Amino acid sequence: AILDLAKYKDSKIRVKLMGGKLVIGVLKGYDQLMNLVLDDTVEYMNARKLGLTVIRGTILVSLSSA
Amino acid sequence: TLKDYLNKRVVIIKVDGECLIASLNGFDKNTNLFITNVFNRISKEFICKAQLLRGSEIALVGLI
Amino acid sequence: MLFFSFFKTLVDQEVVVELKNDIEIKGTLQSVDQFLNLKLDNISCTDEKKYPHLGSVRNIFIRGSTVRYVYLNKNMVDTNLLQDATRREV
Amino acid sequence: VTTEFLSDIIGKTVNVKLASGLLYSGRLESIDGFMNVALSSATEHYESNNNKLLNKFNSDVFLRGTQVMYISEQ
Amino acid sequence: PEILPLEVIDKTINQKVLIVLQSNREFEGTLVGFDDFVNVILEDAVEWLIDNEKVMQHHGRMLLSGNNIAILVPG
Amino acid sequence: TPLDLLKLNLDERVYIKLRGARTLVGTLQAFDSHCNIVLSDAVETIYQLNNEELSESERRCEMVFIRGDTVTLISTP
Amino acid sequence: MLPLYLLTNAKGQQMQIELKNGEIIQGILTNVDNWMNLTLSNVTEYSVKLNEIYIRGTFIKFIKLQDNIIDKVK
Numbered sequence A: 001a002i003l004d005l006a007k008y009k010d011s012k013i014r015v016k017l018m019g020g021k022l023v024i025g026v027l028k029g030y031d032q033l034m035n036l037v038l039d040d041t042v043e044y045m046n047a048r049k050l051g052l053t054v055i056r057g058t059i060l061v062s063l064s065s066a
Numbered sequence B: 001t002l003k004d005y006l007n008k009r010v011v012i013i014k015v016d017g018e019c020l021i022a023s024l025n026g027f028d029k030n031t032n033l034f035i036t037n038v039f040n041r042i043s044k045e046f047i048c049k050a051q052l053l054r055g056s057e058i059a060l061v062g063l064i
Numbered sequence C: 001m002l003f004f005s006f007f008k009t010l011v012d013q014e015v016v017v018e019l020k021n022d023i024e025i026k027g028t029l030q031s032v033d034q035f036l037n038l039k040l041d042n043i044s045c046t047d048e049k050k051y052p053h054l055g056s057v058r059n060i061f062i063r064g065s066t067v068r069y070v071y072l073n074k075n076m077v078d079t080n081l082l083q084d085a086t087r088r089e090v
Numbered sequence D: 001v002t003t004e005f006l007s008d009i010i011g012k013t014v015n016v017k018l019a020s021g022l023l024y025s026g027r028l029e030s031i032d033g034f035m036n037v038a039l040s041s042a043t044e045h046y047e048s049n050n051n052k053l054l055n056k057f058n059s060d061v062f063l064r065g066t067q068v069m070y071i072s073e074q
Numbered sequence E: 001p002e003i004l005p006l007e008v009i010d011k012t013i014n015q016k017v018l019i020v021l022q023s024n025r026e027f028e029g030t031l032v033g034f035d036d037f038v039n040v041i042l043e044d045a046v047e048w049l050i051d052n053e054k055v056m057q058h059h060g061r062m063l064l065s066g067n068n069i070a071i072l073v074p075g
Numbered sequence F: 001t002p003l004d005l006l007k008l009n010l011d012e013r014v015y016i017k018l019r020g021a022r023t024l025v026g027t028l029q030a031f032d033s034h035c036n037i038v039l040s041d042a043v044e045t046i047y048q049l050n051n052e053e054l055s056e057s058e059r060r061c062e063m064v065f066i067r068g069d070t071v072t073l074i075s076t077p
Numbered sequence G: 001m002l003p004l005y006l007l008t009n010a011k012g013q014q015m016q017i018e019l020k021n022g023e024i025i026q027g028i029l030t031n032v033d034n035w036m037n038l039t040l041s042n043v044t045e046y047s048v049k050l051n052e053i054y055i056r057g058t059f060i061k062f063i064k065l066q067d068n069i070i071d072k073v074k
Helices: C002-009 C080-088 D002-008 E005-011 G003-009 G069-073
Strands: A012-017 A021-029 A036-043 A053-055 A060-065 B008-014 B019-026 B033-040 B050-053 B058-063 C014-019 C023-029 C040-044 C059-062 D013-018 D022-031 D037-046 D053-063 D068-073 E016-021 E025-033 E040-049 E053-057 E061-064 E069-074 F013-018 F022-028 F037-047 F056-059 F063-066 F071-075 G014-019 G024-031 G038-046 G049-055 G060-065
Touching: A012 A036, A021 A053, A036 E005, A053 E005, B033 G003, B050 G003, B058 C023, C002 C080, C014 C040, C023 C059, D002 E061, D013 D037, D022 D053, E005 E069, E016 E040, E025 E061, F013 F037, F022 F063, G003 G069, G014 G038, G024 G049
Parallel strands: none
Antiparallel strands: A012 A021, A012 A060, A021 A036, A036 A053, A053 E069, A060 G049, B008 B019, B008 B058, B019 B033, B033 B050, B050 G060, B058 C059, C014 C023, C023 C040, C040 C059, D013 D022, D013 D068, D022 D037, D037 D053, D053 F071, D068 E061, E016 E025, E016 E069, E025 E040, E040 E053, E040 E061, F013 F022, F013 F071, F022 F037, F037 F056, F037 F063, G014 G024, G014 G060, G024 G038, G038 G049
16 A cells, blocks of 8 residues: 555544544544544544544545644 | 637536636536636635646536 | 437437527537437438527537426437336435 | 345335435435445435435436445435 | 554444535434445434534435444444 | 346336536436436426526437536436 | 646656645655556645655645646656
């Protein structure tokens, strides 16, 4: 894979989804298809907190460190 | 096919609204247009000397 | 492959093509490909406002996804052959 | 599991929603790989069945794969 | 070593789950099963429209399609 | 199976709904795996909300090809 | 030649990326693949400084390439 997610693991990342969405969370799990498993997740669509969440990789727009 | 359109100035209209006059220098099966000497049709505004235009955006292309 | 074939069979045809973003253009279809693109020769006027800001563009390449229709007449297209083909396929 | 579900709900009255918000209530005739649904005796509604009925279709109605969002049942 | 999403999904079977789609629409209910495309089988789902509006209460088994799903939240 | 089911209403009148509120009525003469439709003896009805009031626009075309991306529902009137 | 090929060639060049939503994304290219998933380093966006970003292929409108794209690559 072009983006290795071992360094991003156990760190607060900021991900974007399609249809006007933003999800910040600590990257706990991942795979080859860029489907993430975020812990301590907070969606900012102003605010919307979640527990343990699973982000999909078929509409993952952007991903950055935080 | 866009093999006749290479090395020639072309008028390219998008899905959203805009229209671009520029020189087409490369194409692929997914319609990603490699373009040089970029300009806008209505505004006559120079964007840049070279760019890539994604095939999802291209609504129309025209030889001129 | 049915539809592609049909398209091919309409080689050299003055046909109007309405696109997604209010663009209606007439032209003589030349080349046809797997994904149903249209290269039209001799671009003529259909409507006054919908027809886009072109003039000297005599040859175009329409992206297959952006077409809404391909406006044929009742004397310009196949039908029960297509039906037969469909039946044959699954 | 999905396949099994599909197999099961053949010949049942089913709620099928598309992307625009049109809920279709009718008897399920068939369905295949890309989620293209084939209903019959369909009665389309906006959002929910408690709201007003727009149009009615006695013949075999076809719902496309990319438009359909879910397939629920009563 | 790394935690798979599929595994997580599996774990969430027979437990309450909230499935957020790409549009401003959500579904809350009990999970039954899944596959590679994430075509969820959701038993007794409650359709919410956000920004909240309760749309419809389902009495059966809902096949939620894998195209529109964005987030999957156990509990 | 659904495709097969649509082989019955070929060469008879049909009712087709597209995205953008475009009602198309004619006779079904073609379809395939992607659901691309060709109607004969057809007539289009375009719902278009403008200036905060309803207004239909009728486009009469004795034949029309339709791409599968636009298609939502097929039925009989 | 191809756009993908060009992109591949230009590894460690500046490029301003535009998305379907609206934002401008300036950055230096690090890696490219077959679907055009763009990874940038020394990243800065407009209506936020970043060390590294990941950008999807289909969501891009266009990429404003620099003037020396033919000289450095070819």
